[PDB]
């Protein structure tokens, strides 16, 4: 009876109903399958589960936060629809992506639809003008985080902007800022929005936001370690300097080792032997362990903020899962 | 001293300032050029001019409608950014499109940014929750209109959804519904939103909406005539059944003539001789004149609604221009 299974049982059916409800407003019958596709392919629903748990911890009630929970999961899926176009992703959750099944241009029409469904959910919250502003701010954060992650790549893009605006250097501080935007902001919002749905306590909302942000950063760092040590070397093959282990290593490596790691990342096609060489360079400065220590720092930060939230037992279990506490 | 020149002089600089203001909120310096590009390439700004004229006719003041005017022009440009991706358009307003200059995937990041700038403008209107709902409804209308226009094509798309969901038949009623969504709704909104910015009179807002809708339909029909009789045969080469002249003709042509016109539209590559044959088929049932008569019907409808709006002299001049009264 892990926490995600337990909360899926408790909240899952109402979350799915809410997603379909807002997407379905005004939806033409011959567009229905294409539009609902992205929310019918499965997914862990961690973000809306967090929203509802946060609302329940602070108020005893979760149902009032269903509109907010739909907002956060629809934003997640909006971002995925476009990310699949941008990265030409064929498969997600073990099934074809929207762009694969329907076409890239059809997926654009679907993505556009998702954002107006998000607005319908905003208008259904207890505080519509507040949520409207927070949604605009969070989507701009995600868009900016994605822009940065792409400009932190060393190769592999054909868009003139992505090549010409590529960053010359990517520091650890740059990496942390990028992941806070790309991954942290929406987890922060998931928690904060659960509180805002049921409470006017500004301190509690802010503690929730800070908890979710730190949790999201820890999650992303752990994911980055997995995306190096494993498919071994995934992020290396994808030329990413925006990877916690890579960013950590580039900060410690000597002149020629640093230069060599960057040479490998910039290879137009990264070979298996290049991957092992890059990993050896990362290991030569203990970058994997440094990354895990950084994740621990953010996990502990998340705990400090979470201690400010009452009746937080379920939130604590979620945290352990979101940040893959056990794995690390 | 035509009306557009006169209103550009009066309102133009404040409109441009507003567009940049909302886009600039939260905008990173190294993304600025890419994001502002679409509003720096020129354009007639007919929609925001209509918003401001409507506000001034009903209240004597236009400045209170600047947020609404920015909303309508940003929605216009949001739609163009994506339309350029979908149709792979290289040039617009005599300059490269966002997708051409920066790349298709960079243009997606820009399009996403535009929608949150729209939300910032919504939150700056006199009635934020009302405008928020109206924006969601209008963008869904435009998205649905675009979907329909594409499914009304006879050939020329590679997206599985666009091929497989292609409509078997496109009637005149289908055509009118599609243009009301794709072109009319945003012109309707431009006028209605000028009124909503300065007045709580529901009748005046509704008259404005109906005026703009009819104007937008008349405009689209005239544009469609131009896109057949001219570049002669543009919409025929693009396989469009969603063209007023084509829709009109398909309604009158006999069995074999109808079948032949549809054969030509479905040609994978439409040749010059195919164009002349199709035009001859259109002319054989007087479809061009029938289309112009249909535009006249919508223009006259627009006039009837406009008569309900006080101090409407400038609005009348705009109408004559929007619907290309002189040309037709
Ligand atoms: Cl409840
Ligand atoms: Cl004024």
XYZ file of C-alpha atoms and ligand atoms in Angstrom:
658
model
C 0.000 0.000 0.000
C 2.491 2.628 -1.168
C 1.295 6.241 -1.083
C 0.779 6.671 -4.829
C -1.342 3.514 -5.055
C -3.338 4.630 -2.045
C -3.973 8.114 -3.384
C -4.784 6.826 -6.882
C -7.513 4.772 -5.247
C -8.783 7.743 -3.245
C -8.497 10.604 -5.723
C -7.802 8.980 -9.105
C -11.263 8.647 -10.566
C -12.262 12.248 -9.689
C -9.007 13.584 -11.187
C -9.632 11.759 -14.490
C -13.242 12.974 -14.562
C -12.078 16.564 -14.069
C -9.492 16.367 -16.876
C -12.121 15.105 -19.325
C -14.684 17.614 -18.096
C -12.594 20.699 -18.812
C -11.231 19.368 -22.133
C -14.745 18.503 -23.238
C -16.173 22.024 -22.972
C -16.988 23.041 -26.564
C -15.209 20.000 -27.978
C -16.378 18.834 -31.428
C -17.161 15.086 -31.657
C -14.718 14.432 -34.521
C -11.882 16.129 -32.507
C -12.673 14.328 -29.256
C -10.428 11.300 -29.651
C -7.453 13.455 -30.688
C -7.923 15.866 -27.748
C -8.552 13.270 -25.028
C -5.709 11.055 -26.252
C -2.999 12.618 -24.094
C -4.948 12.100 -20.843
C -5.978 8.564 -21.792
C -2.412 7.231 -22.169
C -1.834 6.823 -18.425
C 0.743 8.575 -16.259
C 1.453 8.670 -12.530
C -0.634 11.812 -11.844
C 1.850 12.770 -9.126
C 1.174 16.487 -9.480
C -2.633 16.480 -8.964
C -2.224 13.876 -6.193
C 0.074 16.378 -4.459
C -2.423 19.210 -4.933
C -5.249 17.198 -3.389
C -3.068 15.879 -0.527
C -1.991 19.451 0.265
C -5.611 20.649 0.338
C -6.593 17.724 2.574
C -3.713 18.242 4.995
C -4.599 21.893 5.599
C -8.439 21.675 5.548
C -9.572 18.016 5.781
C -11.133 18.334 2.310
C -9.688 17.547 -1.078
C -12.621 17.884 -3.437
C -12.559 21.745 -3.419
C -9.054 21.456 -4.926
C -10.160 19.371 -7.936
C -10.163 22.349 -10.283
C -6.588 23.234 -9.219
C -5.601 19.565 -9.553
C -6.947 19.499 -13.131
C -5.033 22.749 -13.838
C -1.707 21.331 -12.758
C -2.086 18.022 -14.618
C -3.372 19.759 -17.762
C -0.337 22.089 -17.692
C 1.877 19.011 -17.339
C 0.223 17.423 -20.352
C 0.252 20.646 -22.378
C 3.991 20.811 -21.869
C 4.374 17.146 -22.871
C 2.377 17.529 -26.103
C 4.710 20.310 -27.204
C 7.858 18.679 -25.830
C 7.041 15.610 -27.952
C 6.845 17.832 -31.040
C 10.066 19.673 -30.238
C 12.066 16.509 -29.521
C 10.207 14.455 -32.143
C 9.297 11.880 -29.515
C 7.514 8.819 -30.898
C 6.650 7.043 -27.653
C 5.570 8.075 -24.157
C 4.166 5.951 -21.356
C 4.685 2.957 -23.699
C 2.293 4.314 -26.349
C 2.593 6.580 -29.395
C 2.676 10.297 -28.625
C 0.023 12.690 -29.893
C 2.374 13.881 -32.640
C 3.118 10.281 -33.690
C -0.494 9.074 -33.812
C -2.116 12.225 -35.264
C 0.740 14.310 -36.804
C 2.817 17.250 -35.578
C 0.398 19.848 -36.909
C -2.640 18.123 -35.478
C -0.778 18.028 -32.156
C -0.398 21.817 -32.331
C -4.190 22.170 -32.624
C -4.549 19.826 -29.643
C -1.974 21.772 -27.583
C -3.818 24.997 -28.277
C -7.035 23.326 -27.071
C -5.376 22.156 -23.842
C -4.428 25.717 -22.869
C -8.026 26.932 -23.161
C -9.196 23.909 -21.161
C -6.683 25.084 -18.505
C -8.383 28.494 -18.602
C -11.800 26.811 -18.100
C -10.415 25.116 -14.993
C -8.971 28.432 -13.774
C -12.422 29.977 -14.064
C -13.825 27.069 -11.987
C -11.439 27.570 -8.997
C -12.422 29.307 -5.781
C -10.191 32.289 -6.679
C -10.183 32.734 -10.472
C -8.154 35.937 -10.897
C -5.463 34.640 -8.496
C -5.188 31.294 -10.240
C -5.210 32.994 -13.660
C -2.122 35.016 -12.737
C -0.377 32.031 -11.165
C -0.995 29.878 -14.217
C 0.452 32.540 -16.546
C 3.528 32.793 -14.321
C 4.033 29.020 -14.076
C 3.634 28.384 -17.807
C 6.103 31.183 -18.581
C 8.508 29.531 -16.098
C 8.169 26.155 -17.826
C 8.601 27.766 -21.249
C 11.728 29.592 -20.042
C 13.102 26.423 -18.411
C 12.634 24.490 -21.687
C 14.296 27.282 -23.670
C 17.282 27.164 -21.316
C 17.544 23.370 -21.297
C 17.707 23.470 -25.109
C 20.277 26.301 -25.226
C 22.365 24.303 -22.716
C 22.731 21.520 -25.314
C 26.083 21.212 -27.081
C 24.759 19.914 -30.449
C 21.809 18.165 -32.125
C 19.340 20.910 -33.086
C 18.436 22.330 -36.501
C 16.572 25.519 -35.396
C 18.658 28.623 -36.110
C 17.710 30.116 -32.753
C 18.751 26.965 -30.853
C 22.155 26.916 -32.625
C 22.869 30.625 -32.675
C 21.680 31.406 -29.126
C 23.373 28.347 -27.634
C 25.062 29.299 -24.354
C 28.849 29.428 -24.345
C 29.059 28.134 -20.768
C 26.683 26.333 -18.401
C 27.522 26.594 -14.708
C 26.016 24.681 -11.803
C 24.109 27.838 -10.809
C 22.772 28.011 -14.398
C 21.725 24.363 -14.159
C 19.875 24.910 -10.845
C 18.033 27.952 -12.203
C 16.996 25.983 -15.297
C 15.663 22.965 -13.388
C 13.820 25.203 -10.882
C 11.955 26.623 -13.858
C 11.561 23.473 -15.980
C 10.583 20.992 -13.240
C 10.407 22.726 -9.844
C 7.911 25.483 -10.610
C 5.047 23.146 -11.520
C 5.607 20.922 -8.463
C 5.749 24.073 -6.310
C 2.493 25.176 -7.943
C 0.879 21.749 -7.393
C 1.412 22.074 -3.628
C 0.692 25.814 -3.348
C -2.531 25.497 -5.405
C -3.876 22.747 -3.122
C -3.496 25.153 -0.208
C -4.908 28.165 -2.053
C -8.032 26.099 -2.899
C -9.000 25.666 0.751
C -7.169 28.351 2.765
C -6.379 32.064 2.816
C -3.274 31.486 4.990
C -0.459 33.108 3.000
C 2.294 31.568 5.096
C 0.973 28.063 4.453
C 0.698 28.676 0.713
C 4.290 29.991 0.649
C 5.585 27.019 2.663
C 3.839 24.703 0.240
C 5.361 26.480 -2.772
C 8.857 26.293 -1.293
C 8.397 22.640 -0.359
C 7.296 21.712 -3.906
C 10.075 23.730 -5.563
C 12.790 22.027 -3.529
C 11.177 18.629 -4.070
C 11.098 19.244 -7.822
C 14.753 20.232 -7.933
C 15.756 17.105 -5.956
C 13.643 14.975 -8.270
C 15.293 16.432 -11.394
C 18.831 15.887 -10.033
C 18.075 12.240 -9.276
C 16.543 11.803 -12.728
C 19.717 13.301 -14.214
C 21.891 10.780 -12.357
C 19.709 8.013 -13.753
C 20.013 9.571 -17.224
C 23.800 9.119 -17.011
C 24.363 5.882 -15.092
C 21.152 4.147 -16.197
C 20.291 3.004 -21.021
C 23.739 4.181 -19.914
C 24.698 7.706 -21.033
C 21.322 8.923 -22.345
C 21.950 12.629 -21.621
C 25.481 12.404 -22.993
C 24.183 11.081 -26.318
C 21.682 13.960 -26.290
C 24.506 16.497 -25.855
C 23.135 17.911 -22.620
C 25.245 20.193 -20.501
C 22.013 20.827 -18.530
C 22.474 17.622 -16.541
C 23.381 17.756 -12.872
C 26.279 15.267 -13.122
C 27.706 17.008 -16.192
C 27.336 20.469 -14.653
C 28.982 19.227 -11.447
C 31.857 17.612 -13.355
C 32.506 20.644 -15.617
C 32.985 22.656 -12.432
C 35.843 20.484 -11.128
C 37.616 19.041 -14.141
C 41.031 20.383 -15.149
C 41.563 22.368 -18.362
C 42.084 19.463 -20.782
C 39.604 17.084 -19.137
C 36.948 19.791 -19.180
C 37.750 20.548 -22.794
C 37.496 16.822 -23.640
C 34.126 16.312 -21.942
C 32.726 19.237 -23.929
C 34.221 17.805 -27.125
C 32.354 14.564 -26.508
C 29.022 16.326 -25.798
C 29.460 18.335 -29.011
C 30.060 15.268 -31.190
C 27.392 15.245 -33.848
C 26.904 11.542 -33.150
C 28.088 10.316 -29.725
C 29.487 6.768 -29.919
C 29.361 4.136 -27.190
C 33.079 4.556 -26.589
C 32.527 8.311 -26.236
C 29.905 7.651 -23.588
C 32.254 5.462 -21.519
C 35.030 8.073 -21.837
C 32.675 10.835 -20.682
C 31.448 8.761 -17.732
C 35.097 8.064 -16.803
C 35.691 11.809 -16.798
C 32.608 12.375 -14.598
C 33.813 9.619 -12.207
C 37.341 11.064 -12.074
C 36.012 13.969 -9.971
C 33.296 11.974 -8.177
C 30.568 13.911 -9.975
C 27.893 11.220 -9.449
C 28.207 11.305 -5.667
C 28.386 15.111 -5.690
C 25.115 15.164 -7.647
C 23.422 12.806 -5.178
C 24.651 14.999 -2.333
C 23.110 18.000 -4.070
C 19.804 16.113 -4.345
C 20.044 15.380 -0.616
C 20.475 19.087 0.110
C 17.271 19.927 -1.806
C 15.379 17.006 -0.218
C 16.323 18.315 3.240
C 15.276 21.814 2.230
C 11.919 20.384 1.124
C 11.588 18.750 4.554
C 12.200 22.022 6.363
C 9.412 23.754 4.420
C 7.122 20.787 4.814
C 7.485 20.963 8.604
C 5.518 24.248 8.465
C 2.482 22.459 6.994
C 0.043 20.849 9.449
C -1.184 17.237 9.293
C 1.590 16.553 6.822
C 1.974 12.761 7.081
C 0.736 11.939 3.579
C 2.697 14.831 2.079
C 5.809 13.336 3.739
C 5.154 9.947 2.107
C 4.645 11.673 -1.249
C 7.922 13.547 -0.852
C 9.807 10.356 -0.246
C 8.339 9.039 -3.499
C 8.626 12.208 -5.635
C 12.317 12.552 -4.795
C 12.915 8.786 -5.057
C 14.265 8.827 -1.503
C 14.598 5.036 -1.457
C 16.418 4.784 -4.795
C 18.947 7.388 -3.603
C -7.012 60.512 -45.087
C -8.561 57.038 -45.200
C -9.857 55.662 -41.896
C -7.047 53.173 -41.270
C -4.367 55.829 -41.803
C -6.252 58.196 -39.535
C -6.679 55.665 -36.752
C -3.076 54.447 -37.052
C -2.048 58.028 -36.373
C -4.422 58.327 -33.420
C -4.112 54.931 -31.752
C -1.112 53.239 -33.394
C 1.705 54.149 -31.059
C -0.263 53.212 -27.900
C -1.279 49.866 -29.448
C 2.359 48.988 -30.242
C 3.451 50.033 -26.745
C 0.794 47.782 -25.207
C 1.808 44.748 -27.297
C 5.441 45.109 -26.214
C 4.455 45.786 -22.615
C 2.526 42.556 -22.119
C 5.034 40.412 -24.063
C 7.872 41.884 -22.039
C 6.592 40.793 -18.621
C 9.135 38.226 -17.379
C 10.875 38.108 -20.751
C 14.544 37.031 -20.701
C 16.910 39.358 -22.626
C 18.256 36.611 -24.915
C 14.639 35.614 -25.867
C 13.463 39.182 -26.442
C 14.227 39.508 -30.140
C 12.593 36.150 -30.927
C 9.434 36.997 -28.931
C 8.969 40.573 -30.164
C 9.680 39.598 -33.774
C 6.079 38.835 -34.720
C 4.797 42.253 -33.577
C 7.706 44.103 -35.183
C 7.027 42.845 -38.732
C 4.179 45.290 -39.389
C 0.540 44.492 -40.110
C -2.604 46.580 -40.530
C -3.712 46.306 -36.870
C -7.329 46.366 -38.046
C -8.586 44.383 -35.064
C -7.242 46.601 -32.229
C -8.210 49.707 -34.239
C -11.770 48.338 -34.258
C -11.677 47.664 -30.514
C -10.558 51.208 -29.736
C -13.027 52.786 -32.205
C -15.859 50.788 -30.611
C -14.862 51.945 -27.116
C -14.644 55.557 -28.312
C -18.005 55.469 -30.080
C -19.846 54.266 -26.975
C -17.962 56.240 -24.263
C -15.825 58.998 -25.862
C -12.691 57.269 -24.529
C -10.438 54.737 -26.171
C -7.520 54.412 -23.792
C -9.458 52.235 -21.259
C -9.782 49.669 -24.079
C -6.017 49.367 -24.685
C -5.732 46.136 -22.722
C -8.577 44.596 -24.778
C -6.973 45.940 -27.968
C -3.670 44.248 -27.053
C -5.606 41.019 -26.316
C -7.220 40.899 -29.724
C -4.039 41.693 -31.676
C -1.970 39.254 -29.596
C -4.541 36.507 -30.298
C -4.295 37.377 -33.997
C -0.524 37.065 -33.863
C -0.612 33.895 -31.756
C -2.765 32.307 -34.423
C -0.394 33.499 -37.167
C 2.728 32.107 -35.465
C 1.125 28.671 -35.357
C -0.522 28.955 -38.772
C 2.934 29.655 -40.240
C 4.229 26.446 -38.647
C 1.270 24.370 -39.805
C 1.385 25.636 -43.398
C 5.186 25.947 -43.418
C 4.907 29.589 -44.429
C 8.246 31.252 -45.164
C 7.096 34.837 -45.667
C 4.476 37.125 -44.132
C 4.071 40.874 -44.471
C 7.050 40.728 -46.887
C 9.439 39.374 -44.232
C 10.456 35.925 -42.979
C 8.021 34.320 -40.548
C 8.991 33.438 -36.991
C 9.385 29.782 -37.979
C 11.597 30.728 -40.950
C 13.917 33.096 -39.069
C 14.185 31.160 -35.776
C 13.013 27.563 -36.527
C 9.717 25.718 -36.093
C 10.527 24.564 -32.574
C 11.685 27.977 -31.449
C 8.417 29.334 -32.857
C 6.514 26.912 -30.612
C 8.276 28.381 -27.558
C 7.371 31.859 -28.820
C 3.716 30.882 -29.412
C 3.484 29.520 -25.893
C 4.864 32.840 -24.601
C 2.285 34.837 -26.578
C -0.617 33.030 -24.893
C 0.633 33.923 -21.408
C 1.159 37.522 -22.532
C -2.533 37.406 -23.585
C -3.365 36.269 -20.043
C -1.365 39.223 -18.619
C -3.471 41.566 -20.744
C -6.661 39.817 -19.589
C -5.641 40.454 -15.992
C -5.123 44.156 -16.865
C -8.674 44.701 -18.270
C -11.476 46.361 -16.339
C -13.282 42.998 -16.019
C -10.682 40.212 -15.774
C -12.857 37.141 -15.148
C -15.225 38.148 -17.989
C -12.409 38.720 -20.449
C -10.690 35.495 -19.339
C -13.767 33.464 -20.275
C -14.262 35.327 -23.548
C -10.654 34.796 -24.563
C -10.883 31.041 -23.890
C -14.056 30.875 -25.983
C -12.614 32.901 -28.876
C -9.345 30.960 -29.049
C -11.262 27.665 -29.026
C -13.387 29.067 -31.889
C -10.291 29.967 -33.913
C -8.730 26.568 -33.200
C -11.941 24.817 -34.292
C -12.221 27.004 -37.413
C -8.622 26.127 -38.395
C -9.270 22.424 -37.790
C -12.316 22.597 -40.062
C -10.586 24.603 -42.792
C -7.872 21.920 -42.892
C -10.339 18.997 -42.916
C -12.171 20.766 -45.773
C -9.038 20.406 -47.936
C -9.089 17.752 -50.657
C -5.346 16.879 -50.580
C -1.904 18.187 -49.573
C -1.418 17.222 -45.914
C 0.835 14.591 -44.335
C -0.709 14.461 -40.805
C -2.647 11.224 -40.291
C -5.449 13.096 -38.549
C -5.787 15.616 -41.405
C -5.985 12.789 -43.992
C -8.093 10.331 -42.046
C -10.579 12.849 -40.597
C -10.954 14.724 -43.881
C -14.627 15.553 -44.463
C -16.413 13.627 -47.195
C -18.534 16.636 -48.172
C -18.334 20.392 -47.578
C -21.591 22.301 -47.983
C -22.132 26.050 -48.105
C -23.558 25.885 -44.565
C -20.367 24.047 -43.498
C -18.279 26.761 -45.153
C -20.175 29.578 -43.371
C -19.825 27.874 -39.984
C -16.085 27.417 -40.566
C -15.420 31.035 -41.566
C -17.549 32.362 -38.670
C -15.188 30.496 -36.370
C -11.883 31.034 -38.206
C -12.261 34.732 -39.102
C -15.560 36.117 -37.772
C -15.213 35.289 -34.083
C -12.091 37.395 -33.523
C -13.528 40.406 -35.388
C -16.741 40.011 -33.364
C -14.593 39.902 -30.224
C -12.588 42.979 -31.304
C -15.791 45.051 -31.438
C -17.510 43.499 -28.401
C -14.364 43.885 -26.240
C -14.104 47.609 -27.048
C -17.625 48.023 -25.689
C -17.092 45.800 -22.648
C -14.033 47.924 -21.713
C -16.098 51.079 -21.239
C -19.744 50.024 -20.783
C -21.964 47.594 -18.890
C -24.704 47.845 -21.560
C -25.294 44.226 -22.596
C -27.344 45.135 -25.648
C -24.547 47.314 -27.013
C -21.940 44.608 -26.445
C -24.165 42.067 -28.241
C -24.791 44.437 -31.165
C -21.060 44.972 -31.441
C -20.380 41.219 -31.424
C -22.972 40.595 -34.132
C -21.665 43.487 -36.219
C -18.072 42.178 -36.063
C -19.088 38.578 -36.802
C -20.995 39.556 -39.936
C -18.193 41.887 -41.012
C -15.667 39.075 -40.587
C -17.725 36.654 -42.649
C -18.115 39.230 -45.460
C -14.390 39.914 -45.338
C -13.528 36.203 -45.630
C -15.876 35.678 -48.611
C -14.306 38.595 -50.475
C -10.828 37.286 -49.668
C -11.896 33.897 -51.048
C -13.025 35.480 -54.327
C -9.639 37.166 -54.568
C -7.959 33.827 -53.797
C -9.610 32.363 -56.913
C -9.703 35.178 -59.471
C -6.575 36.987 -58.254
C -2.035 34.827 -58.435
C -4.997 33.215 -60.202
C -6.330 30.025 -58.575
C -4.422 30.127 -55.265
C -7.065 28.228 -53.249
C -7.533 25.704 -56.043
C -3.822 24.861 -56.001
C -4.123 24.498 -52.217
C -6.972 21.983 -52.618
C -9.453 24.026 -50.614
C -13.105 23.129 -50.634
C -13.420 25.678 -47.782
C -13.535 28.572 -50.242
C -16.742 30.502 -50.782
C -16.646 30.305 -54.604
C -15.862 26.580 -54.541
C -18.539 25.854 -51.935
C -21.061 27.882 -53.951
C -20.150 26.099 -57.192
C -20.250 22.573 -55.677
C -23.825 23.340 -54.651
C -25.023 24.023 -58.212
C -22.876 21.946 -60.532
C -24.331 18.845 -62.189
C -23.156 15.328 -61.299
C -20.165 15.081 -63.657
C -19.097 18.727 -63.380
C -19.192 18.489 -59.596
C -17.237 15.258 -59.730
C -14.663 16.902 -62.040
C -14.150 19.976 -59.853
C -13.473 17.701 -56.881
C -11.069 15.632 -58.989
C -9.091 18.774 -59.757
C -8.976 19.899 -56.092
C -7.770 16.414 -55.116
C -4.914 16.379 -57.636
C -1.716 15.927 -55.699
C -0.196 18.704 -57.801
C -2.680 21.096 -59.459
C -1.426 22.263 -62.872
C -2.107 25.620 -64.503
C -4.445 23.960 -66.982
C -6.301 22.368 -64.059
C -6.760 25.793 -62.517
C -8.289 27.245 -65.702
C -10.591 24.210 -66.027
C -11.740 24.593 -62.416
C -12.362 28.326 -62.852
C -14.363 27.544 -66.022
C -16.475 25.161 -63.962
C -16.994 27.828 -61.264
C -17.965 30.375 -63.972
C -20.372 27.923 -65.631
C -22.762 28.356 -62.676
C -21.887 32.004 -61.966
C -20.264 31.059 -58.664
C -18.123 34.229 -58.464
C -21.121 36.553 -58.595
C -23.055 34.321 -56.186
C -20.142 34.591 -53.741
C -20.055 38.390 -54.026
C -23.805 38.460 -53.441
C -23.289 36.379 -50.311
C -20.660 38.873 -49.115
C -23.184 41.656 -49.737
C -25.740 39.856 -47.573
C -23.276 39.680 -44.652
C -22.166 43.304 -45.175
C -25.809 44.418 -44.962
C -26.302 42.301 -41.857
C -23.256 44.010 -40.328
C -24.856 47.377 -41.132
C -28.086 46.456 -39.380
C -26.228 45.558 -36.172
C -24.027 48.605 -36.445
C -27.098 50.860 -36.551
C -27.717 49.895 -32.895
C -24.369 51.404 -31.848
C -24.301 55.143 -31.080
C -21.855 57.660 -32.580
C -20.937 55.030 -35.132
C -19.441 57.135 -37.946
C -15.871 55.864 -37.617
C -17.063 52.282 -37.163
C -18.974 52.698 -40.457
C -15.798 53.826 -42.253
C -13.918 50.868 -40.762
C -16.618 48.476 -41.945
C -16.356 49.740 -45.471
C -12.624 49.025 -45.298
C -12.721 45.685 -43.421
C -15.185 44.241 -45.928
C -13.412 45.878 -48.891
C -16.688 47.566 -49.824
C -15.012 49.554 -52.604
C -13.228 46.571 -54.167
C -16.540 44.670 -54.295
Cl -13.365 16.369 0.247
Cl -9.180 58.085 -24.206
